[PDB]
């Protein structure tokens, strides 16, 4: 039985950022290399774990988060990191122990005039904790007054900085259990 | 390499029922859907339903509703369709492939399309 | 479900020639869950092109595609005495559905 990473990532749809997406990866076998020496990535950095050694150890869990930002907004997907993605949109912990993938998809997320279809939170009244979401839609707008989400503005044209990336975060769990997936 | 194997020709009486298998090798079998469709003489290739190999969820047309039941055995990697309630109308190749249009886990829907196809099963009715 | 409507019906051409063949959605369909797939006779059909530019292993790189919208084209290059079949454009956005495919012959 092995690991349904294809199904993550040939993926036709991914969830806006504000809102993101997790599926949970246990009880199969997974070969990582397929991802490590994939061309179609731009960034593969993992922290606490070297991607050349991840096929000889076991893990209880593995979580797979994904989301759609700009590609100016993925730096800010890492530890120690702060912004409007890392604060009111999606937090990771200083002692991650996990690899952020991304690639850029502006020939499936964009089109002439611009997709709208996808939005980052802009107002809220605290910081996120790690791996909080916060999809409530509280703001009548007015003076002082405005809607929590704003739309992104990715068109096709735009520099590479405003273009769409897709973004899969594995967080690796390790607990005090028998692990339910190992590499090959 | 991947090869899907099917069954002979049958014919049937009109009302009967016909189970068409399809052995599938070369390939991790949990990890990839089965999809059937089925092509009457003269006509264009049509869709009746797909299964998951690894939780055995099912996904049909409306126009087989009722009529087709889906399963599969992984001991000896093979899928199964059964139509039931035959009619003259359901003379036709009916052919497996290899799924990737759809998650065999969680039901996403991916990027691709049916592959390495069988060599096809003629159901006559009459 | 969205419907996929195949043109022209029947192509005449000869051998060394070049060949496009049109699909149009009566609804937008996204190039994600696009793909063609090609039939000989007393054959299968085949995985041609998936994603709407992606193509199949296995398949000459004289075919290619592409398209947006409601609008999805198949190009061969140059006809080669075995590129003379039926071929078929698929959705699934929405359920799945083929369309009802276009014939290229000498």
């Known amino acids: 039985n092995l690991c349904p990473f294809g199904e993550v990532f040939n993926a036709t749809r991914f969830a806006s950022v504000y809102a993101w997406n997790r599926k949970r990866i246990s009880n199969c076998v997974a070969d990582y290399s397929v991802l490590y020496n994939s061309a179609s990535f731009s960034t593969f950095k993992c922290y606490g774990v070297c991607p050349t050694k991840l096929n000889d150890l076991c893990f209880t869990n593995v979580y797979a988060d994904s989301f759609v930002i700009r590609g100016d907004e993925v730096r800010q997907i890492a530890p120690g990191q702060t912004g409007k993605i890392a604060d009111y949109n999606y937090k990771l912990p200083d002692d991650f122990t996990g690899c952020v993938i991304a690639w850029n998809s502006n020939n499936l997320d964009s089109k002439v005039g611009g997709n709208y279809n996808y939005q980052y939170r802009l107002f809220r009244k605290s910081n996120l904790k790690p791996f909080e979401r916060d999809i409530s839609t509280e703001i009548v707008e007015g003076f002082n007054c405005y809607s929590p989400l704003q739309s992104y503005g990715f068109q096709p044209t735009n520099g590479v900085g405003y273009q769409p990336y897709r973004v899969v975060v594995l967080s690796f769990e390790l607990l005090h259990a028998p692990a339910t997936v190992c590499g090959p | 390499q991947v090869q899907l194997v099917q069954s002979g020709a049958e014919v049937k009486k009109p009302g009967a029922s016909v189970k068409v298998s399809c052995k599938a090798s070369?390939?991790?079998?949990?990890?990839?859907?089965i999809s059937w469709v089925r092509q009457a003489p003269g006509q264009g290739l049509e869709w009746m339903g797909w299964?998951?190999?690894?939780?055995?969820?099912?996904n049909y047309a409306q126009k087989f509703q009722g009529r087709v039941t889906m399963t599969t055995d992984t001991s000896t990697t093979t899928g199964y369709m059964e139509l039931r309630r035959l009619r003259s109308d359901d003379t036709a190749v009916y052919y497996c492939?290899?799924?990737?249009?759809?998650?065999?886990?969680?039901?996403?829907?991916?990027?691709?399309?049916?592959?390495?196809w069988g060599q096809g099963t003629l159901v006559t009715v009459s | 479900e969205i419907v996929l409507t195949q043109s022209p019906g029947t192509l005449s051409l000869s051998p060394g020639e070049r060949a496009t063949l049109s699909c149009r959605a009566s609804?937008?369909?996204?190039?994600?869950?696009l793909a063609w797939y090609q039939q000989k006779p007393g054959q299968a059909p085949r995985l041609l092109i998936y994603?709407?530019?992606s193509r199949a292993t296995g398949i000459p790189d004289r075919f290619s595609g592409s398209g947006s919208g409601t609008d999805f084209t198949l190009t061969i290059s140059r006809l080669e005495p075995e590129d003379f079949a039926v071929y078929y454009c698929?959705?699934?956005?929405?359920?799945?559905?083929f369309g009802g495919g276009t014939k290229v012959e000498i």
């Open positions: 492939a290899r799924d990737y249009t759809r998650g065999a886990w969680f039901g996403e829907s991916l990027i691709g399309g049916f592959d390495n």
């Open positions: 070369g390939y991790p079998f949990t990890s990839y859907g």
């Open positions: 299964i998951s190999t690894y939780n055995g969820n099912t």
């Open positions: 609804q937008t369909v996204s190039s994600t869950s």
């Open positions: 994603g709407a530019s």
């Open positions: 698929q959705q699934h956005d929405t359920s799945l559905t």
